[PDB]
Nucleic acid binder design. Structure first.
Length: 1657
RNA sequence: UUGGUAGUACACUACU
RNA sequence: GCUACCAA
């Protein structure tokens, strides 16, 4: 082959090389040698003279000696060789390449540059590129004329020696990162392998053998060939892809064409909504429902539409608590007549009859309260003895003993067993496996009329004036701003607040708050009494998670009550009537929503009514009060399907028939549900009849006006009136968001989920046999089409970023320690398998002991078993992520080597996988999490490159993309139709019988929007298809592929673990063989596991699956395009993909076919496209329009963006962790912020903000006149002037609130001061200038309020403040906690660890890359009280009520607050904290320097706060204008290093442990010494210990922590988040965004232009 | 840890 | 579950 001396030299250089530099040079020399070697052998075959390089002037001098080299101006190119024959100049170049790319550039360059000289000399110059493929050895020559001179070229040439040399060089430097960078060139770069060896076990894996045998022989070879391929060692990175693509090209192209030709087979009759479709669907629905339910036509089977009866108040009587107590007692005893429970009721009134001894009652109660309020903790070891007060046995305020002297045992029993339903079961069952749930007959005539009268009656009663002042918190504290935003909404509030509706719901809320408060400490042998501001309504809280209660209403006329279907009986008493509701057993989470309901109801009504004069508020309220309060499964079964039913009904193409027939399953237990089912039914019919008004006709300015200039011509759904399209959509989609979470029980959501999973698995085992098919067989993939489409997409996507593998590694921290990755160190749940029999069986015993004790303590009248019955029980426990990492680190299973390297190892080591449900809906092992991390993050990055894949799109990016696509599509439709008819239009407008002939022949536009949904995405996918996605991937090495595929093989052998909960119930009633799917699939409860093969579990492979989804839509695009060119038309196809969400947009212009046939064609190919890739498009849900896009609950209407922003407003009432006034309010406010960027109008945002305040204050009894109300305790004559940190009212422009939330409260206050106290001459200056002028301020001139505020800002805010502490862990399952306990018990353990952390203070804020660092930082965490509390799951209802009940107890650690400004035993009450705060401030004065420090930490430290400050000062507003055409704009960056963890270590002073580390460190030190800190805490430490006379290791830790936490939040750069705002115009800069925001959020009806007087940022 | 004895604590309170 | 006392 090559020269031998030359060969041995290369072999010496390779052996000697120690540098990427040296090795790189060898690579170049090998290539250049190989190129020369070819040329020499090539020239020998052509029998011409060999020349390595030849100047072009020499070519001329040779063929034209008479030409003047000084005047010819020859090009500056150097061809390898040439040949002048027959007056034709052949320019030659040799290439050794498997690709033609080098040749194209060489040709284009040479050809272009030889044109000038060709024309001058009259010499034809032919450019000849002679290439040889070094693999096949085939020659390729472009020049047809050169092949005529050499029609037979033979080059017996062998490149084997060059391949061996290259291979030896590359093997030696394979791990050299620098080598890969230099060698790689230049559209593809790799990194070092993640592992050395592959996985031989893969090739023997039965599941691989299954995957193999299922393919034809060629595809087997190609798969094994593709796995063993690696781009690093190959000529090009894409050879494998290209090879496999070309092999499958024939069958692919035939599929595209065969499918495209189907356009001519379309009948044009596609699935389509109409009267009959709806009717027949409904018919089939009723049939199915009857099989599955027990239908009743009887009203007495009715369930409560609302868990509440109500009556108006009585101004004739007193509203004193004690008065009301007696009033009820007497009213109960004076019940007249005989009925089943009247004797018990009278007895109850007797048991709370304190007679006239009210003063005794009060003082007894206040005595008990004072005691309880004396302690932060609960009172212990002091028995509560009931006091005798008249006939009543009083245990506590409004708690009464169940006195057996005052009630017959026979009557008492009826009350519990039958009325309360406590301890009763009627098993009228015939076989072992025979009792269906009962519902009302929604389609019965009279049953409907029954529901209608309830709605009618409730309107007659609640519409009436409540006869109260409308005044309330929302109105008094936010009415002003709401009115200025929009007077209409202000008026609408009053309309509501004046009615019985508002009072009724407000009463239910207050009473429920009190019911819950009261239920907490209620005992098994006591009842309790709840009251509210309405002196006619009460609640009896019956003895015992849940509350059992009955509402009691006092009223004058007997039928004058609001009875939403839960009245038990109305009774005549002494001075009128008394009504009692059925006993209600309601879980406390529902109860908490009831408390919140006034917010929901107000929000709902104002929303539905907003800006619509056709709607009657009365009608709105009657509907809204039920949706707000009917917190039931009944309504849930209606609001979900309503979206699909109604939308399908008005769609171009859809399937109402099937959706209603199969999936609509009403649970009409209440009358309201029956009433609502009807509204939905009519909605569908009404929807179809106005279908043509929604869907656009044949139409640029005619299209956009429809959505922008939205006129009100559609029929309203839930109440009489007319409605715009937007408003129409809100009525359809909003109701789903009324629904509460967890309306289903614990046991019942699991069981349903378990059964579906198991059923699907069982179906597959017995029917699903095939993996591949060409006819879209159920749950199959078209093999060759998958392969070809993957190659094509893998090529296109990989080409648009050359450093992809690097991107993956860096963005997902593959190279870094596992201990530095959030998701691998989280507090999420995780699963581990092992032997925990003893632990659990001991707990089984200990649990039953505590059960019987409490069960024995009654003045009233099993794991071990499981594991004896189950031979194959896979034992397990659920721990936390960080805890499992600790354990594995501790047992040296894991290490702190790069995470990706351990993942690779884990893919071989973990052979058996397990998953289960929660205590991402599946919990997996930590090991499972590691493996899938690699696969999904690889996919993640390539999804980001793929332009159609959107699950990878960061932030709010989707809403902006939808808009860009739809504005691109309106353009295409318009311009394309205008250009196709330019000539027809000209002939027409030039000139009625001959105009008509021409107007038919013109092209018609077709726009269709496919809003699609995929079916059983994860449960019925063809998981095998992803094997190719891995094998074909060029960025993966063979060793990496082998391990990944071995994992995926194992993954298809994974097992689901059935929670013991499911297994008990079945064993409990297992007398013999049973057919329940759970027992069936467990070999009759032999195992607690089931093998789950084909179902990859929901949430685990989203990116991977979403990438293939994109591939399926790329085939779809090609089919539609080919189909339309057969009609010589134009087409634009766009597709947006998001796991099981798909929005595909088609725009067509053609003149040979009716649109109905194109629609019919397009949908069938959509269905087929999904199926060929193993996806099942769901046509019950999938619907088609020509104007409305829907994608992941985002809309685009005729080009304009649209969102159901209401859903965020409804969640702004319940979302908080219940920690404190400031935190809770912050949490609730962020929902209003979200709604704003989603298009919420100004006035409705304020209502949300108002409600948020109310709920927050309500939680801590801080409302006006309430105990913890701080107004009187501070220098302020208005809530707006009291700080936000002390639960003051928020005061700031809405534009500012939107951008920076609660922190705007202070920021605005500081801005008011600048506007007031800077000199008259400086007022028009920027912020920085006005802050400098603070040194010329007079503190003495400031008002008391202003100094109070400033003092708080200075000494408290710098580095939330009034946060209650709780006495509370139950952390037995945490491995790391047990170790923390070993260290507590160890003699010097903890001090040793505290010491270690002070030495490495980096660990106080971060977690080091080191293992030891991590393990020791975790043990440390446990020393924190608040951390340990986080690990235990907490019921939000219990968090809510605990906060209420402890409101008067001392829960403020003021000593923790006070110490921070110095240079008392235990806890304190809220109210006492206020007082202590004021006192301290009085003796702590405020200087001009202090005020500057305030401005510098708040304003000047944040570029955002500077900008926002300037925007408010320097702005001036232009005249108002309408809102027309809203646009999506991304929020720009305002703010302008290395890993914070290491940077902080360097600080404690060696940038070593590059130079840039010092660069970081230098300006970290500047931040320190300017606002001195290093010297501040050193002094602060020295003081504390000198006072104590001994070292205080705790205080030193606290100080250090905050010192370094300040540094941690200074160093770390925040990655700019993508958040998109709907605005009146487009924002192109930071200046635009502020002006628009500032100008868009002031008035509902109009918006303003905002200009500025000076520079801003 | 086991066994025994005795307990297990609090809001609304309102123009109505 | 938590608390106080007692016994091992």
């Amino acid at each position: 082959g090559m020269d031998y001396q030359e060969y041995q030299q290369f072999l010496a250089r390779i052996n000697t090389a120690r540098d990427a530099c040296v090795a790189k040079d060898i690579d170049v020399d090998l290539l250049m040698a190989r190129h020369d070697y070819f040329g020499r052998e090539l020239c020998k075959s052509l029998n011409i003279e060999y020349r390595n390089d030849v100047p072009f002037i020499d070519i001329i001098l040779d063929i034209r000696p008479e030409v003047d080299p000084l005047t010819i101006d020859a090009p500056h190119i150097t061809p390898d060789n040439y040949l002048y024959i027959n007056n034709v100049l052949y320019i030659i170049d040799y290439k050794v390449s498997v690709s033609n790319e080098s040749s194209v550039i060489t040709y284009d360059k040479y050809y272009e540059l030889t044109r000038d000289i060709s024309d001058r000399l009259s010499i034809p110059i032919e450019i000849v590129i002679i290439r040889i493929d070094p693999v096949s050895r085939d020659l390729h020559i472009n020049s047809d004329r050169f092949k005529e001179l050499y029609p037979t070229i033979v080059v017996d040439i062998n490149f084997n020696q060059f391949f061996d040399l290259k291979q030896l060089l590359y093997e030696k430097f394979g791990d050299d990162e620098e080598f890969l960078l230099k060698v790689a060139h230049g559209d593809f770069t790799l990194t070092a392998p993640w592992c050395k060896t592959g996985c031989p076990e893969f090739w023997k894996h039965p599941i691989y053998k299954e995957f193999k045998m299922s393919m034809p022989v060629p595809e087997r070879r190609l798969f094994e060939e593709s796995v063993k391929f690696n781009a690093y060692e190959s000529e090009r990175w894409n050879t494998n892809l290209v090879k496999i693509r070309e092999y499958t090209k024939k069958d692919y192209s035939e599929h595209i064409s065969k499918s495209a030709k189907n356009i001519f087979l379309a009948s044009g009759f596609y699935k389509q909504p109409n009267k009959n479709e709806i009717s027949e669907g409904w018919t089939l629905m009723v049939e199915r429902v009857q099989d599955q339910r027990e239908i009743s036509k009887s009203l007495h089977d009715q369930k409560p539409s609302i868990h509440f009866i109500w009556g108006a108040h009585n101004p004739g009587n007193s509203n004193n608590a004690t008065f009301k107590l007696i009033l009820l007692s007497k009213s109960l005893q004076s019940i007249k007549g005989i009925s089943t429970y009247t004797e018990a009721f009278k007895s109850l009134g007797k048991m709370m009859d304190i007679g006239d001894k009210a003063i005794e009652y009060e003082e007894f109660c206040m005595s008990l309260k004072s005691k309880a309020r004396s302690s932060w903790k609960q009172i212990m070891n002091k028995k509560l003895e009931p006091k005798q007060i008249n006939n009543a046995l009083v245990l506590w305020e409004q708690q009464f003993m169940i006195n057996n002297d005052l009630i017959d045992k026979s009557e008492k029993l009826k009350l519990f067993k039958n009325f309360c339903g406590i301890g009763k079961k009627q098993f009228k069952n015939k076989m072992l496996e025979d009792s269906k749930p009962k519902i009302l007959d929604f389609d019965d005539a009279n049953m409907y009329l029954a529901s209608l009268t309830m709605m009618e009656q409730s309107k007659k009663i609640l519409s009436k004036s409540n006869g109260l002042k409308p005044d309330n918190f929302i109105l008094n504290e936010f009415g002003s701003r709401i009115k200025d935003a929009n007077k209409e909404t202000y008026d609408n509030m009053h309309k509501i607040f004046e009615t019985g509706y508002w009072q009724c719901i407000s009463d239910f809320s207050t009473l429920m708050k009190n019911i819950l408060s009261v239920s907490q400490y209620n005992r098994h042998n006591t009842f309790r009494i709840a009251m509210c501001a309405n002196n006619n309504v009460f609640a009896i809280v019956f003895p015992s998670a849940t509350v059992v209660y009955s509402i009691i209403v006092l009223h004058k006329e007997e039928e004058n009550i609001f009875n939403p279907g839960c009245l038990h009986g109305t009774f005549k008493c002494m001075n009128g009537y008394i009504s009692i509701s059925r006993a209600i057993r309601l879980d406390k989470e529902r109860c908490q929503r009831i408390v919140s309901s006034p917010g929901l109801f107000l929000t709902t009504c104002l929303l539905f009514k907003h800006d619509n004069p056709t709607l009657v508020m009365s009608d709105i309220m009657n509907f809204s009060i039920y949706t707000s309060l009917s917190i039931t499964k009944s309504v849930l079964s209606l609001t979900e399907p309503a979206r699909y039913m109604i939308m399908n009904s008005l769609a171009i193409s859809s399937n109402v028939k099937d959706y209603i027939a199969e999936k609509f399953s009403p649970y009409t237990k209440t009358l309201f549900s029956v009433y609502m089912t009807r509204l939905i039914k009519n909605a569908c019919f009404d929807a179809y009849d106005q279908r043509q008004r929604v869907q656009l006709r044949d139409i640029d300015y005619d299209i956009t006006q429809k959505g922008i200039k939205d006129n009100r011509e559609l029929t309203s759904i839930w109440f009489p009136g007319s409605v715009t399209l937007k408003e129409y959509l809100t009525q359809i989609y909003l109701p789903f968001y009324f629904n509460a979470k967890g309306l289903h029980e614990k046991h019942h959501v699991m069981v349903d989920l378990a059964k579906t999973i198991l059923e699907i698995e069982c179906e597959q085992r017995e029917n699903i046999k095939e993996i591949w098919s060409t006819n879209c067989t159920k749950q199959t993939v078209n093999l060759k089409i998958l392969i070809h489409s993957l190659c094509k997409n893998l090529l296109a996507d990989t080409s648009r970023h050359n450093h992809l593998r690097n991107r993956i590694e860096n963005r997902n921290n593959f190279r870094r320690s596992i201990t530095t990755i959030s998701t691998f160190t989280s507090s999420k749940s995780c699963l581990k398998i092992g032997d925990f029999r003893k632990e659990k069986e001991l707990q089984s015993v200990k649990q039953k002991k505590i059960l019987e004790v409490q069960s024995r303590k009654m003045r009233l009248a099993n794991y071990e078993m499981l594991r004896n019955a189950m031979p194959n029980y896979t034992d397990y426990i659920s721990t936390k992520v960080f805890d499992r990492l600790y354990e594995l680190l501790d047992k040296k299973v894991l290490t702190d080597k790069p995470v990706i390297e351990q993942i690779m190892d884990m893919m071989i080591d973990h052979k058996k996988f397990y998953f289960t449900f929660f205590n991402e809906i599946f919990v997996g092992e930590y090991e499972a999490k590691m493996c899938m991390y690699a696969v999904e993050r690889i996919a993640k990055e390539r999804c980001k490159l793929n332009p159609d894949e959107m699950i990878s799109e960061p932030g709010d990016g989707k809403l902006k993309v939808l808009e860009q696509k739809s504005e691109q599509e309106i353009r295409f439709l318009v311009e394309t139709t205008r250009q196709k008819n330019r000539e027809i239009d000209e002939a027409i407008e030039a000139l009625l019988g001959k105009i008509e002939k021409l107007s038919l022949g013109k092209a018609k536009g077709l726009k269709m929007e496919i809003n699609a949904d995929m079916s059983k995405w994860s449960a019925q996918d063809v998981f095998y298809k992803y094997f190719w996605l891995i094998a074909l991937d060029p960025i993966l090495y063979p060793q990496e592929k082998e391990r990944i595929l071995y994992f995926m093989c194992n993954y298809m052998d994974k097992e689901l673990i059935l929670p013991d909960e499911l297994l008990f119930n079945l064993l409990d009633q297992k007398v013999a063989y049973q057919n329940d799917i759970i027992a069936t699939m467990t070999n009759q409860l032999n195992s607690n596991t089931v093998l789950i093969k084909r179902n990859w579990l929901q949430g685990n492979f989203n990116y991977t699956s979403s990438y293939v989804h994109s591939c399926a839509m790329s085939v779809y695009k090609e089919i539609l395009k080919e189909a339309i060119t057969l009609l010589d038309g134009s087409i634009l196809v766009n597709s947006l993909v998001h796991s099981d969400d798909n929005q595909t947009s088609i725009t067509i212009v053609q003149d040979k076919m009716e649109n109905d046939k194109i629609i019919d064609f397009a949908m069938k190919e959509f269905e087929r496209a999904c199926l060929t890739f193993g996806c099942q498009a769901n046509m019950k849900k999938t619907y088609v329009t020509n104007c409305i896009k829907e994608f992941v609950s985002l809309f685009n209407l005729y080009g304009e963006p649209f969102s159901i922003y209401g859903r965020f407003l409804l969640t702004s009432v319940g979302d908080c962790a219940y920690i404190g006034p400031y935190e809770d309010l912050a949490s609730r406010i962020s929902s209003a912020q979200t709604a704003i960027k989603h298009g919420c109008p100004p006035s409705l945002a304020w209502v949300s903000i108002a409600i948020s305040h109310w709920m927050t204050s309500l939680t801590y009894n801080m409302l006006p006149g309430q105990s913890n109300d701080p107004i009187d305790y501070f220098p302020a004559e208005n809530r707006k002037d009291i700080p936000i940190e002390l639960n003051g009212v928020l005061d700031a422009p809405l534009s500012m609130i939107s951008t920076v939330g609660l922190e705007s409260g202070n920021l605005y206050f500081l801005i008011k001061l600048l506007s007031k106290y800077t000199p008259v001459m400086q007022k028009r200056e920027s912020v920085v200038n006005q802050i400098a002028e603070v040194k010329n301020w007079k503190v003495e001139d400031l008002t008391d309020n202003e100094i109070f505020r400033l003092k708080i800002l200075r000494y408290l805010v710098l580095d939330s403040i009034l946060t209650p502490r709780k006495f509370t862990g139950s952390l037995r399952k945490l491995y790391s906690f047990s170790k923390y306990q070993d260290r507590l018990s160890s003699p010097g353990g903890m001090v040793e660890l505290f010491t270690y952390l002070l030495e490495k203070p980096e660990l106080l804020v971060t977690k080091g890359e080191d293992m030891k660092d991590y393990m020791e930082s975790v043990i440390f965490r446990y020393n924190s009280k608040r951390f340990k509390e986080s690990l235990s799951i907490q019921n939000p209802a219990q968090l809510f009520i605990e906060q209420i009940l402890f409101s008067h107890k001392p829960v403020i650690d003021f000593s923790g607050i006070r110490d921070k400004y110095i240079n008392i035993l235990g806890k304190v009450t809220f109210t006492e904290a206020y007082r202590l705060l004021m006192r301290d401030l009085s003796s702590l004065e405020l200087t001009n320097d202090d005020i500057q420090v305030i401005y510098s930490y708040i304003i000047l430290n944040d570029p955002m706060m500077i900008t926002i400050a300037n925007t408010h000062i320097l702005s001036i507003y232009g005249s108002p204008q309408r809102r027309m055409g809203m646009s999506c704009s991304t929020m720009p960056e305002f703010r302008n290093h290395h890993s914070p963890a290491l940077v902080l270590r360097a600080y404690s002073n060696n940038p070593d442990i590059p130079t840039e580390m010092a660069r970081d460190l230098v300006h970290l030190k500047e931040f320190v010494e300017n606002t001195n800190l290093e010297e501040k805490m050193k002094v602060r430490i020295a003081m504390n210990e000198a006072e104590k006379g001994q070292r205080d290791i705790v205080f030193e830790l606290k100080e250090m922590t905050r010192f370094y936490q300040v540094c941690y939040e200074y160093v770390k750069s925040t990655e700019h988040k993508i958040k998109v705002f709907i605005l009146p115009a487009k924002s192109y800069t930071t200046t635009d965004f502020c002006s628009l925001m500032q100008g868009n959020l002031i008035k509902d009806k109009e918006w303003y232009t905002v200009h500025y007087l000076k520079q801003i940022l």
